[PDB]
């Protein structure tokens, strides 16, 4: 195809290999190997190539495949030198497109179904048919639908809400299997790659498996309840209430479910047990917010069933939103002072419908995502230059200045030359005006330098240096020499003085004479070269140095330099009532300007010469008319000759120009109303001229600590990462636009900026990345609050699940850790690009946030910014208290296992023990086998021991205590031996675990049980990375009178682990036989309690499952929508 | 019974920090790092860049 | 081999792309001293024998010396004023105490 075709092209007229290397040069590895006419070596082929044609006579030149090629390298050669395509890329690279456009976060996300996570399953089911009580008793018989399913054993789970009609789904949930079936692949999922066990999990990351799991259950919980209509009770189950219909195709079940006081109570089953002991004024809707005349409500409180816990994450994401809100007026107001004057929005002044739109933010959050983003972009050019090009083209469609340089030769073609002299004066000037590739864009990548000097430094290119040179004599070097005396002072570099100073010293070689600091930087040194405020010249900082008797020129130009240079000033942008200011390391609502600027006076613009750049102008054509009119410095130069000079550089003096006028009063006010419409805010280290005092050596960021230090003010000045890079441009390129600039000839400024700028604030998208700082904001410090509670950090974080085992974590672990949680919190929120994603690569453990600049003596402004609050660890933190009182519900057990055969006909659930079975450390006659514990084997009949903490033998008798990891690590001898004298024998094992998950197995108690095919495949199936789950095999409860049969259990719990029944025999009347729990009370508080208001949660102790909550209508436009006007 | 080691050695544990100046070669990458800090931050010694 | 067998630190290379990205190689005229390292650390190369010999030299100090070859060291003498011999010097100064 046609593309490999064309490349192959390009690369055969790009690519000679002339290509730069940096080396020292040696007399081997030259391109010149053998020169073929006299053995040779000139290290590049252009002096090849000229050394070849050189030895030929110019007579005999005669055009050949060689004579084209050395003019296409040469070609090729100087274009590849001019900097702006040394620096350029056509396409994004995944680095500058996020910087430029970065995709938003979802925050509104609104629930139509009901807030809950915690439902009822039936597990087995009661039996309705049978002999002692007839069918009519039961409400299952007359198809009454309740709110609690009929079951003789029932128990509630944990689901990801299982009645939400979501608006936008987050692809996190933690649905649950019922305590019967399997439920290890919850709990093996985050660091298990090794478990080749389908049914087991490793222990040592229980804690941090449970906890991502809490992770993920918060923010899946991050949604606003939206009203939904009601409507009027008309059957008089409760009188005059108004009751909820959610939307859906299918709402018989939902009222039931919805209005447990709903139902009548025909009979004394446990559930009409519960409801005839409930209040009855507690239903459906009591309170609403009308605020227009049919119109949807703002608000209201419904008692309906709910989940304390979600309604809590619900309230607190909703205090964030409310926060962050904001109102059409004060977007009126700051759009206007943000664009200062010129264009007019209007806001509507009526009663409105209470909307919603999160934007404000602070700014300690704008701050940290400012060094997020400087981090980024740290030491890379080609991320830094498609943001200036922006700028560029941005500020060319609002720029009235236009350039024309025929303004130039116009003004040219009134000099007079004679036709004899050697030397035009004119002509050289329009031979060599004209930039390289005839770019005119280094002026306006210069404006964007000055906009941002933090992280780039423009300075002038190599390629315009006049030629390794000097030589005053020559005419090109002096125009080249007040080319770059224009061009200088536009960039942004610190150093420019001096390279100003010391291009004229190149100038002038053994005309006058300059002491210098060293052997190293002479006075015949280039000029560029030096780039740092260590190599500036002591005779340039001290005046006296220079002597008038030899070198008034050189002195001279110095007081030129140190008096007549520009100014800094400033411009105060922006406004940071709304979108507060990113501004660091200078004050909010101000930017710098290299340049004086007064602002105008009139809207009618003209041409007068007072301001600092015609100034300087007029200072460098006095000098160059003072050298010129020299003769000794030029002898060769008679009279006519100094006298068209003379003309030639007062008229250019005294062009009519408008460039000096437009950056003196115009371009700061088009930069002040561009810079808050952008995406990559300003970051400014303060500007300063001539001084070796001040200047921003560096400037550094961090990410992490150093050592067992804490403070980030002490440790950032050893864990800083600097951030910079240079630039380049082109100073005749800047050069010529400075001297040929124009207006539109009737032109008048307000009319002209009301017209172009009102399409950028047309457009709304700034508002759109200030939610992202917010989600930038949160990942950090939920990030910081999550890594704190597995591994050892800083910060003063409260612990809760310590009592789980967990794996001494290492830096791996914690950075795979850190990963899961940027990959859950990016497949929530609906984003995926780079977040998070530079903290990563250093440690996660010990990370800070800060930021600093040094000047040159040694003082080095830090900025450390303080770490607002999180509404989502805070959310997580209190998932994790309430899971640390309710572990029972997401399949956890606490303490530990006791293995021992119990042959009883009792009906006690294994779950709670009687306290007799149990033993502990500290219970007399209890053996301990923490240490080395060698099983030394029997003979003659004699029993088999075993090694005691303490250094004694005991036999395989009595009450034994491992640790878990001990059968951990010698499961198959320890499988053999003690399954051989566990099962007949009066062994016993209490083996401590802290927390394990567990299955559930009903049996009849009417019939026989043994639980030796359950508990021996756990304890064979026990390996040194995994375990399985705990089996328990629990009876079932009955509605009457049964008989007994002999039950075998082997593992029992220690302590009480049955939180999650729920109304076992709900339709009896009673429970009999089996263990018996009516409805908890403490869960309803808000029923059963007379004295409870309504606004009441037990949250750290119990969940309640029935609560006010609020519900909303709050509708969300866009700006565009709302804020309009021209 | 001993073995001689060009090299110091502690205790083990996996919980130490990555960033532990107490650590030889840590320490010693420190310092060659600041070293060349130091050498190319005045530019007294590279003209022609 | 034993040693690499045996031992529980995996080598990859990639940690240093990952802190060094540095995406862009256009310029034909300049050269970025992060694509300085890169192009003299080599990351592509997947060969750690030197590391584990080094490692096995400690026992047989007495018979054998373990020393850097002469092309790790730079060319010619080197200088300050070349980028390439400044990396030059890190890594061998980074490589000698083992
Ligand atoms: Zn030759």
Redesign the pocket.
């Known amino acids: 195809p046609m593309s490999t075709r064309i490349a192959e092209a390009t690369s055969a007229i790009v690519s000679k290999h002339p290509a730069r290397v940096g080396l020292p040069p040696t007399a081997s590895s030259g391109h010149?190997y053998?020169?073929?006419?006299?053995?040779?070596v000139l290290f590049s082929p252009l002096d090849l190539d000229a050394?070849?044609a050189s030895?030929g006579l110019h007579g005999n030149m005669t055009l050949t495949s060689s004579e084209i090629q050395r003019h296409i390298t040469e070609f090729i050669s100087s274009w590849q030198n001019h900097p702006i395509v040394q620096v350029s890329a056509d396409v994004e690279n995944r680095k500058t497109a996020q910087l430029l456009h970065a995709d938003t976060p979802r925050l509104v996300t609104w629930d139509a179904g009901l807030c809950t996570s915690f439902k009822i399953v039936p597990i087995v089911p009661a039996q309705v048919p049978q002999d002692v009580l007839a069918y009519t008793f039961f409400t299952s018989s007359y198809a009454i639908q309740s709110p609690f399913p009929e079951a003789a054993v029932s128990r509630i789970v944990v689901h990801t809400r299982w009645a939400s009609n979501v608006d936008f789904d987050r692809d996190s949930s933690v649905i649950m299997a019922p305590p019967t079936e399997n439920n290890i692949h919850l709990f093996k999922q985050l660091l298990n790659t090794e478990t080749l066990s389908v049914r087991g999990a490793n222990p040592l990351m229980f804690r941090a498996n449970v906890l991502h799991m809490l992770l993920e259950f918060v923010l899946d919980n991050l949604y606003l309840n939206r009203h939904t209509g009601f409507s009027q009770d008309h059957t008089p189950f409760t009188e005059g209430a108004n009751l909820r219909s959610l939307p859906g195709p299918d709402a018989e079940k939902w009222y039931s479910i919805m209005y447990p006081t709903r139902m009548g109570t025909p009979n004394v089953s446990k559930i009409c047990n519960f409801v005839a002991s409930c209040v009855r004024n507690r239903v459906g809707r009591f309170d609403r917010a009308q605020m227009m005349n049919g119109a949807m409500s703002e608000w209201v409180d419904v008692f309906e069933t709910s989940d304390a816990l979600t309604v809590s994450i619900r309230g607190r994401w909703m205090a964030r939103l409310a926060r962050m809100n904001i109102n059409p007026t004060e977007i009126e107001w700051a759009l206007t002072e943000c664009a200062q004057g010129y264009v007019t929005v209007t806001s509507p002044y009526a009663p409105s419908v209470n909307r919603l739109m999160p934007y404000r933010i602070s700014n300690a959050e704008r701050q940290i995502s400012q060094i997020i983003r400087v981090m980024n972009i740290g030491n890379n050019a080609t991320v830094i230059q498609p943001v200036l090009q922006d700028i560029s083209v941005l500020l060319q469609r609002i720029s009235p200045l236009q350039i024309d340089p025929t303004i130039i030769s116009n003004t040219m073609s009134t000099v007079s030359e004679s036709t004899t002299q050697t030397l035009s004066p004119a002509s050289s000037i329009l031979g060599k005006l004209r930039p390289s590739n005839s770019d005119f864009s280094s002026f306006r990548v210069a404006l964007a330098g000055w906009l941002y000097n933090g992280v780039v430094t423009t300075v002038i290119d190599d390629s315009s240096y006049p030629k390794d040179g000097g030589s005053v004599t020559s005419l090109e070097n002096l125009w080249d020499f007040f080319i770059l005396a224009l061009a200088l002072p536009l960039t942004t570099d610190p150093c420019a003085p001096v390279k100003a100073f010391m291009t004229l010293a190149n100038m002038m070689v053994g005309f006058e004479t300059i002491p210098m600091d060293n052997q190293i930087y002479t006075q015949s040194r280039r000029a560029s070269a030096f780039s740092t405020p260590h190599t500036w010249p002591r005779c340039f900082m001290n005046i006296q140095l220079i002597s008038p008797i030899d070198a008034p020129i050189l002195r001279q130009w110095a007081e030129i330099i140190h008096r007549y240079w520009p100014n800094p000033s400033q411009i105060r942008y922006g406004t940071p009532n709304v979108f507060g200011s990113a501004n660091l390391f200078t004050p909010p609502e101000v930017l710098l300007l290299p340049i004086d600027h007064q602002p105008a006076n009139v809207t009618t613009p003209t041409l007068d010469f007072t301001n600092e750049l015609t100034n300087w102008r007029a200072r460098v054509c006095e000098l160059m008319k003072n050298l010129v009119d020299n003769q000794r410095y030029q002898p060769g130069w008679t009279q006519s000759l100094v006298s068209s000079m003379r003309g030639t550089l007062g008229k250019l003096k005294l062009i009519k120009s408008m460039t000096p006028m437009y950056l003196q009063q115009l371009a700061p006010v088009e930069l002040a109303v561009i810079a808050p419409m952008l995406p990559f805010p300003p970051f400014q280290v303060p500007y300063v001229r001539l001084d070796r005092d001040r200047v921003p050596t560096m400037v550094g960021v961090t990410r992490q600590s150093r050592d067992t230090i804490t403070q980030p003010a002490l440790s950032l000045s050893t864990t800083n990462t600097t951030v910079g890079v240079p630039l380049a441009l082109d100073a005749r390129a800047i050069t010529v636009a400075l001297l040929s600039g124009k207006y539109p000839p009737d032109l008048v400024t307000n009319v002209w900026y009301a017209d172009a700028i009102y399409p950028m604030y047309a457009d709304t998208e700034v508002f759109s990345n200030l939610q992202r700082d917010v989600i930038t904001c949160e990942a950090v410090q939920t990030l910081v609050t999550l890594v704190a509670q597995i591994s050892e950090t800083q910060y003063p974080v409260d612990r809760y699940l310590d009592w789980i085992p967990s794996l001494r974590a290492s830096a791996a672990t914690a950075a795979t850790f850190a990963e899961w949680v940027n990959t859950s919190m990016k497949t929530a929120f609906d984003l995926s690009d780079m977040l998070l994603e530079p903290l990563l690569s250093g440690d996660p453990r010990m990370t800070q946030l800060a930021i600093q600049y040094q000047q040159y003596n040694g003082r080095t402004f830090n900025v450390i910014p303080e770490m607002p609050g999180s509404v989502i660890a805070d959310c997580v933190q209190l998932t994790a208290e309430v899971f640390n009182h309710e572990y029972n519900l997401f399949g956890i057990a606490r303490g530990d296992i006791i293995i021992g055969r119990v042959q009883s006909t009792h009906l006690w659930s294994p779950l709670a023990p009687p306290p007799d079975l149990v033993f502990d450390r500290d219970t007399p006659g209890v053996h301990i086998f923490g240490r080395d514990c060698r099983i030394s084997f029997g003979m003659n009949g004699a029993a088999p021991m075993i090694r005691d903490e303490t250094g004694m033998m005991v036999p395989f008798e009595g009450n034994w205590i491992f640790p878990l990891a001990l059968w951990q690590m010698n499961t198959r001898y320890f499988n053999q031996q003690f399954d051989a004298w566990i099962k007949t024998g009066e062994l016993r094992i209490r083996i401590e675990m802290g927390a394990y998950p567990y299955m559930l197995h009903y049996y009849d108690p009417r019939q026989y049980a043994n639980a030796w095919n359950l508990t021996s495949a756990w304890l064979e199936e026990i390996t040194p990375t995994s375990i399985p789950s705990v089996p328990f095999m629990v009876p079932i409860s009955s509605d009457h009178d049964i008989s007994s049969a002999p039950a075998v259990q082997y593992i029992i719990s220690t302590e009480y682990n049955d939180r999650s029944l729920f109304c076992t025999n709900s339709s009896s009347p009673q429970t009999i036989a089996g263990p018996d729990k009516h409805i908890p009370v403490e869960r309803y508080n808000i029923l059963t309690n007379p004295d409870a208001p309504p606004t009441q949660i037990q949250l750290p102790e119990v969940v309640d499952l029935y609560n006010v909550v609020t519900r909303y209508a709050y509708e969300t436009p866009p700006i565009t929508a709302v804020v309009m006007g021209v």
Request: contains cysteine; hydrophobic residues 25%.
């Open positions: 010149g053998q020169c073929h006419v006299c053995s040779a050394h070849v030895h």
